[PDB]
Every structure is written in C-alpha cells, then in structure tokens.
C-alpha cells in the first residue's frame, strides 16, 4: 500500500509539472 | 503524515490554478 500511495505521489508530482508547464504558459503571454 | 503533505501540496496545486485563472480573466489580453 504504502508503495502504490508513493507511485501516486510520483503521479502527482507529475501533475505539478504540468502545473509549471502552465505558470510558464501564463508567463509567455 | 504523508498524504497529507500531498494534501498540502494538492492546495498549493489547486491556489496556483486559481490564481491562474484569476489572472486570465482580468488580463485575458
């Protein structure tokens, strides 16, 4: 359990990256 | 302990995006 809860930590901090990607987006303009 | 410091990185998560999305609706341009 503990590793499948890590892999979806790995997952989300997957998501944060796109969450940068948009900061980056917002940025451009 | 730990899933809820994803809890707290998920509320920085969902703060940037609503900040994002405050942020293009008042400089849409």
């Known amino acids: 359990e503990k590793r499948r809860q890590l892999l979806k930590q790995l997952h989300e901090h ?16």
């Not at 997957?14 to 303009?29: C, G, I, N, P, V």
């Open 14 to 29: 997957e998501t944060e990256l796109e969450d940068e990607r948009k900061q980056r987006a917002l940025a451009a303009a």
